[PDB]
Amino acid sequence: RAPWDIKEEEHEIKMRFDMPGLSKEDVKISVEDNVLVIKGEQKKEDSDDSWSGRSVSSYGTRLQLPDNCEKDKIKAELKNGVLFITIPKTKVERKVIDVQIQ
Template sequence: MPGLTKEDVKITIDDGVLNIKGEHKEEEDGGSDDDSWSAWSHGYYNKILVLPDDAKVDDIKAELKDGVLSIIVPKTEQSKKDVKQVPIN
């Protein structure tokens, strides 16, 4: 998310769905006394991810550093599952 600050990014969790939204607004004015100009740049980002059933929703952490958003989703300890092989007919 280059160019965005943590104030530009919103992360929400609702019913097992992680929603990441980012919005970039930039306004630039320039020129000289005889010639002036203005430019606007606008970008919007939205990503929706379904969390696994064993995600610890209350322990999710996020960090935005140097344009890279890192989200850590810890999972609960699960008991060892038996692997069952399915025969092929």
């Protein structure tokens, strides 16, 4: 599962993934054809360990970057069964939101 978010600094894919039970070895982040790619495979773990949810397989996600994204400055972090990808925008531009807040 993967959400699309926007920050002022960055989106393209300000993405997550729900990667639980993946090692960072098993994951690949890439840009191919200037499109983001997240792929990998789920392995096995300890028989002491449980999982309810979907099963194991390969998995592999493809996202259309803006043509003017910083492909070079893409970062990816994995912590606690999630991946986070960040693509820096060419210009930081927050969506303005005029909500009544003091």
